[PDB]
Structures are given as structure tokens and as C-alpha cells.
């Protein structure tokens, strides 16, 4: 999930854009 | 700004700024 | 805090605070 | 949509909770 991937470890633009509609 | 630890409201804000008019979904449990 | 005009990052923040661990989806166009 | 209902007019807790998962 996003919190594991972007809070508990370092986020990336690839990860964030996976959650855009 | 996105290549760091983003937690809580900071993460919701990054999504807001990156996704723009597309909007986004924020699911912290799943 | 929710019974006002909420635009932009203010709205994303209200959703964040109201929905809590449930998370939310933010769709401004649709 | 949420922007019409909560930005362009006054939001409510009922409206906001419709968009929780």
C-alpha cells in the first residue's frame, strides 16, 4: 500500500501516480 | 518533492499536487 | 469544520481528517 | 461531484463521508 511504500519507505513519482485516477 | 518519506497529511498533499485535476484515491489500510 | 466552502487542498485535508484510517477518494472533474 | 457540492457550495459531513472508502 501507499503508506508502506511512501511513508514507511521513500516515496517516488511512479508510486504516487499509481494512485491518481 | 516526492522522493522522501511522506506520511499522513504530507502524503495526501503530495498526491493532491502530483495528480492535479485527475484526482486520486488514498487508501492507508489496504 | 466541515460546514463551510472547502476548496482545493482544504477539501483534501477535510477528507483526510473526516475519513481517517478509512481513507478516501478525491475526484474533482467527475 | 465533491467540488460542486463542497467548494462551489457549502460542504456537509454527509457529503464528505460519501467519499470515504
Amino acid at each position: 500500500g501507499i503508506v508502506e511504500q511512501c511513508c514507511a519507505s521513500v516515496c517516488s513519482l511512479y508510486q504516487l501516480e499509481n494512485y491518481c485516477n | 518533492f516526492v522522493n522522501q518519506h511522506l506520511c499522513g497529511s504530507h502524503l495526501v498533499e503530495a498526491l493532491y499536487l502530483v495528480c492535479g485535476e485527475r484526482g486520486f484515491f488514498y487508501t492507508p489500510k489496504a
Side-chain angles (χ1 to χ4, degrees), chain A, chain B:
Chain A
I2 193 171
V3 167
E4 308 83 273
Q5 296 310 316
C6 281
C7 171
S9 56
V10 169
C11 204
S12 71
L13 185 48
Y14 171 103
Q15 276 289 351
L16 284 178
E17 282 199 333
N18 278 350
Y19 294 95
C20 304
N21 293 323
Chain B
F1 53 104
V2 314
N3 294 291
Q4 50 182 355
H5 294 279
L6 297 173
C7 303
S9 74
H10 203 6
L11 176 56
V12 177
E13 166 177 298
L15 281 160
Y16 175 70
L17 289 171
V18 160
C19 298
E21 45 185 342
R22 285 180 279 176
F24 61 91
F25 56 99
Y26 172 71
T27 305
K29 303 325 311 203

